[PDB]
Chains A and B, each alone.
With several copies, the nearest count.
Chain A
């Protein structure tokens, strides 16, 4: 039933998120008509590079004329928001199968719009183009026709000659903070009338790395497994992480110095098919928080509650010095994983180390 990944796909410029500064700059250009021949959009993957690119081509060929506020009904706006527009050629330089469609289209520039004001060329990562067609651009960019405009996007503007960077109007899109996506997703589920446990949103949040598009993609899987709810339990399930309870229930047992419980919970956990690196990412998480409340009892979230009494205990009861050790012990733990002959092993071996090097009850040697 309508995967938000589509239902919240940005339509206007207003719909985009937090990237104001880089939108304001496009709000002007389109309003004052100051249309340059080339637009560059740099950024990690997951940032609305392409997305914000369409929102340009939706404001260039719009029949309402060149607007910053396109109308969602005109035949041009609809087809643009469906990846199928006669003057919107979408090239993926990173594409292997389309390499010949990449070369032939850049050497065969059409100097006449078939249905729109201008002819829009959307190119995903141009630094990945062939040495041949790459020059096809160079020349067309030096002396570009009036109707043909360009929209470039890169995962790295560095590997792009300074011969082209200087010839375009760059725009760096910063990834989005955790608590920003955390906020969006909340406002999206609240506005879709879906139940939802806070703890679980932050998970979907961080899960998608500063990538709202993705943040929604997951939000959907969660909703599919959660049977219409985003519950920590459905979420943590998918991510294959630990349900705040279980993470702390290890730590608790790690501190207590009793292997058994630990190793036990690992299985109990390996049972649920965890993502080994994350059984540490999640402990480290808590350890962090603990020693933080020892510095300011105030430093405690608002959903931590379900585990709060326990957070506070550990905190008030274990030496910050100490905690700074488990934290670091697991930390360097994560570190080695890639080289531990098995991601589980590494993860078990590592808690043993903690246990072998516990500071109140280490493992004994006859």
Chain B
């Protein structure tokens, strides 16, 4: 299985077509790109019929299994596209795939797609099969160091002069959801055809664009002054956010916060962060919180969240926002006793 990057794919495709193509990674567009890059050469061969079946334990597998079991009377062929689960091929699916691993024939091109595979999942009978015929195309979101480079490269193919500083800002918001970044680019292509994206030009478009993730709220709450926090909240309403999703998002970060503070003298803040593995830059920020939130401030914040969560689901629609507001203010100043 020739392992290679999206970029070498077009080159490899040329030399010939291989039994099956494994698109593994989390990036929305590379997967897409690599995908269409494949089919573009298949229909270009004799593959008119194209199929796509998602892997979730609740699928209708007889349909699938028997659709490839059949050789065609008119040699018409097909392109089977399996959509791997979100979590990926569990134990029962290490076989379900091992089965379709010895059926392939030069007139049934296989293209599996999902997020990368774990060292374990990459030994599950099935993968080890394609292990000779196939090819895998690593599709992963570039890191913090190449993140901006990507935006620079790509931009350049969209015939764009995106300044470094204008590149940075963009890279700091939507820091990661490659999806949007790819978007805001073709959009900006549109604002200024034959224009330049100086820092003043992009920074405003982005500033005014004013989109806040409830993640933005939380992060503020991360000891950041309440001002922005509260604003991002009422803004986060006029973005028709559901309150249920705000609650549990802060939870993850508020609970995480309890442990960490709980583990002082357990292990230096350092070692700990890795351990939980959310520490992506948030480390400085998480730390900063863990310096002003008292063991008790935490709890209070946890009792409230609960009241909210509960009060949210027991009188279904008592305008929770009220409480959320108070809540945030709690995570920003010393507290009292009621």
Contact = CB atoms under 8 A, between A and B. Distances in A.
Given A29-B190, A44-B240, A299 B29 contact: no
Nearest to B194: A32
Given A169-B186, A175-B238, A209-B237, A324 B32 contact: no
Contact of A28 (B193, B225, B237): B193
Contacts of A327: 338
Nearest to A155: B240
Contact of A25 (B191, B325, B326): B191
28 contacts: A21-B209, A25-B187, A28-B190, A29-B190, A44-B239, A44-B240, A142-B36, A155-B240, A162-B28, A163-B32, A165-B179, A166-B32, A169-B183, A170-B183, A174-B210, A209-B238, A210-B238, A292-B336, A296-B334, A298-B226, A298-B333, A299-B329, A299-B333, A301-B227, A302-B234, A324-B337, A324-B338, A331-B338
Contacts of B234: 302
B230 interface: yes
Contacts of A288: 326
Contacts, number: 91
Interface residues of A, number: 45
A292 B240 contact: no
Given A28-B192, A296-B334, 4 more contacts: A20-B208, A29-B190, A172-B209, A301-B329
B211 interface: yes
Interface in B278-305: none
A183 interface: no
Interface of A: 20-21, 24-26, 28-29, 32, 34, 36, 43-45, 135, 142, 155-156, 158, 162-163, 165-166, 169-172, 174-175, 209-210, 285, 288-289, 291-292, 295-296, 298-299, 301-302, 324, 327-328, 331
Contact of A45 (B240, B317, B322): B240
B307 interface: no
Contacts of A43: 240
B302 to A, nearest CB: 18
A292 B238 contact: no
B334 A171 contact: no
Contacts of A32: 193
A56 to B, nearest CB: 13
B231 A302 contact: yes
Interface in B160-218: 179, 183, 186-187, 190-193, 205, 208-211
Given A162-B28, A210-B238, A298-B226, A291 B336 contact: yes
Given A174-B210, A285-B326, A169 B179 contact: no
Contacts of A328: 338
B330 to A, nearest CB: 9
